[PDB]
Write an enzyme that holds these catalytic residues in place. Structure first.
Site, PDB file in Angstrom:
ATOM      1  N   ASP A   1     -25.335   5.828 -60.375  1.00 52.62           N
ATOM      2  CA  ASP A   1     -24.671   5.520 -58.875  1.00 52.62           C
ATOM      3  C   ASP A   1     -23.404   6.366 -59.121  1.00 52.62           C
ATOM      4  OD1 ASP A   1     -23.723   4.576 -56.827  1.00 52.62           O
ATOM      5  OD2 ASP A   1     -23.733   2.536 -57.378  1.00 52.62           O
ATOM      6  N   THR A   2     -23.812   7.586 -58.246  1.00 57.22           N
ATOM      7  CA  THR A   2     -22.473   8.512 -58.109  1.00 57.22           C
ATOM      8  C   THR A   2     -21.378   7.971 -57.172  1.00 57.22           C
ATOM      9  OG1 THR A   2     -23.656   9.623 -56.623  1.00 57.22           O
ATOM     10  CG2 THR A   2     -23.998  10.505 -58.818  1.00 57.22           C
ATOM     11  N   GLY A   3     -21.847   6.919 -56.322  1.00 55.53           N
ATOM     12  CA  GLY A   3     -20.665   6.546 -55.669  1.00 55.53           C
ATOM     13  C   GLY A   3     -20.043   5.305 -56.160  1.00 55.53           C
TER      14      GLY A   3
HETATM   15  C1  LIG Z   1     -26.006   1.099 -48.257  1.00 52.45           C
HETATM   16  C2  LIG Z   1     -24.650   0.396 -49.138  1.00 52.45           C
HETATM   17  C3  LIG Z   1     -23.722   1.482 -49.156  1.00 52.45           C
HETATM   18  C4  LIG Z   1     -24.366  -0.721 -48.644  1.00 52.45           C
HETATM   19  N1  LIG Z   1     -25.259   0.337 -50.651  1.00 52.45           N
HETATM   20  C5  LIG Z   1     -24.459  -0.120 -51.439  1.00 52.45           C
HETATM   21  O1  LIG Z   1     -23.365  -0.459 -51.071  1.00 52.45           O
HETATM   22  C6  LIG Z   1     -25.019  -0.251 -52.845  1.00 52.45           C
HETATM   23  C7  LIG Z   1     -25.215  -1.951 -52.997  1.00 52.45           C
HETATM   24  N2  LIG Z   1     -25.797  -2.152 -54.331  1.00 52.45           N
HETATM   25  C8  LIG Z   1     -26.189  -3.445 -54.696  1.00 52.45           C
HETATM   26  C9  LIG Z   1     -26.829  -4.240 -53.502  1.00 52.45           C
HETATM   27  C10 LIG Z   1     -26.185  -5.099 -52.919  1.00 52.45           C
HETATM   28  C11 LIG Z   1     -26.719  -6.108 -52.306  1.00 52.45           C
HETATM   29  C12 LIG Z   1     -28.038  -5.850 -52.022  1.00 52.45           C
HETATM   30  N3  LIG Z   1     -28.867  -4.820 -52.400  1.00 52.45           N
HETATM   31  C13 LIG Z   1     -28.021  -4.076 -53.228  1.00 52.45           C
HETATM   32  C14 LIG Z   1     -25.260  -1.514 -55.712  1.00 52.45           C
HETATM   33  C15 LIG Z   1     -24.844   0.084 -55.011  1.00 52.45           C
HETATM   34  N4  LIG Z   1     -24.171   0.155 -53.945  1.00 52.45           N
HETATM   35  C16 LIG Z   1     -23.935   1.731 -53.666  1.00 52.45           C
HETATM   36  C17 LIG Z   1     -22.418   2.069 -54.153  1.00 52.45           C
HETATM   37  O2  LIG Z   1     -22.648   3.265 -54.599  1.00 52.45           O
HETATM   38  C18 LIG Z   1     -21.371   2.017 -52.967  1.00 52.45           C
HETATM   39  C19 LIG Z   1     -20.279   2.377 -53.385  1.00 52.45           C
HETATM   40  C20 LIG Z   1     -19.297   2.522 -52.101  1.00 52.45           C
HETATM   41  C21 LIG Z   1     -17.780   2.727 -52.119  1.00 52.45           C
HETATM   42  C22 LIG Z   1     -17.592   3.755 -52.589  1.00 52.45           C
HETATM   43  C23 LIG Z   1     -15.710   4.023 -52.761  1.00 52.45           C
HETATM   44  C24 LIG Z   1     -15.041   3.157 -52.174  1.00 52.45           C
HETATM   45  C25 LIG Z   1     -15.678   2.018 -51.610  1.00 52.45           C
HETATM   46  C26 LIG Z   1     -17.031   1.764 -51.517  1.00 52.45           C
HETATM   47  C27 LIG Z   1     -19.348   1.164 -54.029  1.00 52.45           C
HETATM   48  O3  LIG Z   1     -19.488   0.183 -53.908  1.00 52.45           O
HETATM   49  N5  LIG Z   1     -18.698   1.534 -54.885  1.00 52.45           N
HETATM   50  C28 LIG Z   1     -17.784   0.922 -56.146  1.00 52.45           C
HETATM   51  C29 LIG Z   1     -18.045   0.372 -57.099  1.00 52.45           C
HETATM   52  C30 LIG Z   1     -19.513   0.138 -57.704  1.00 52.45           C
HETATM   53  C31 LIG Z   1     -19.426  -0.302 -59.001  1.00 52.45           C
HETATM   54  C32 LIG Z   1     -18.275  -0.437 -59.859  1.00 52.45           C
HETATM   55  C33 LIG Z   1     -17.121  -0.132 -59.341  1.00 52.45           C
HETATM   56  C34 LIG Z   1     -16.884   0.368 -57.950  1.00 52.45           C
HETATM   57  C35 LIG Z   1     -15.763   0.671 -57.293  1.00 52.45           C
HETATM   58  C36 LIG Z   1     -16.208   1.517 -56.006  1.00 52.45           C
HETATM   59  O4  LIG Z   1     -16.297   2.913 -56.460  1.00 52.45           O
END
Ligand SMILES: CC(C)(C)NC(=O)[C@@H]1CN(Cc2cccnc2)CCN1C[C@@H](O)C[C@@H](Cc1ccccc1)C(=O)N[C@H]1c2ccccc2C[C@H]1O
Ligand SMILES: [Cl-]
Ligand SMILES: [Cl-]
Lengths: 99, 99
Positions: B25-27
């Protein structure tokens, strides 16, 4: 380009005639942008993140330019904490994860 | 490998002697895994994403293999909806985004 992951992989996008910064996110199934106007019909959707679900508007067949690369697809609009380019549009620009 | 994004980029990881599935997960800034036991002391952390924040346990300098690549680094444990390999470990294994 080749983008490293030392920092968040943020790029400029053009969507709905606007420029925004957005995160290239291989963990996101969908593309989700902060509140803006988009043309056409929409329908509501619930999408789930690490902290639970949010309600968004789903718009289909939206043209986007992502770091210079054109694509079309579904864009969700709502109270997201980050603008996110998800896999539905990453595939279209040819993005791959490499190691 | 070169991983395309037409499906979720799921790989097998090994942590604590056990195999698990996790999302590249690059996000994600950090790496978070579903409840499990890890050795040593932990520090508190809050991580935010779509939906809000969750509270997790931060363990440092944990041995983890990601798709066969060895890493040693910080692993968060808590009520995540999915096992996620974030940028802290994607950088260790030399992953890049390319388009
Ligand atoms: C379509 C949508 C965006 C809603 N998808 C997600 O959020 C999915 C959810 N699943 C799971 C899912 C949940 C529900 C249903 N099906 C699947 C797990 C993976 N995420 C993807 C993540 O990469 C999203 C990022 C978004 C973000 C980035 C920066 C700042 C705020 C939000 C994310 O949540 N990243 C955060 C993050 C993640 C892990 C650890 C630490 C951190 C901090 C932060 O970088
Ligand atoms: Cl789409
Ligand atoms: Cl392809």
């Amino acid at each position: 380009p080749q983008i490293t992951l030392w920092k968040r992989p943020l790029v400029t996008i053009k969507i709905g005639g606007q420029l925004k910064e957005a995160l290239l996110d291989t963990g996101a199934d969908d593309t989700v942008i902060e509140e803006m106007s988009l043309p056409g019909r929409w329908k509501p959707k619930m999408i789930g993140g690490i902290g639970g679900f949010i309600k968004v508007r789903q718009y289909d067949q939206i043209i986007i330019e992502i770091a210079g690369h054109k694509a079309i697809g579904t864009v969700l609009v709502g109270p997201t904490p980050a603008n996110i380019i998800g896999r539905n549009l990453l595939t279209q620009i040819g993005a791959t994860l490499n190691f």
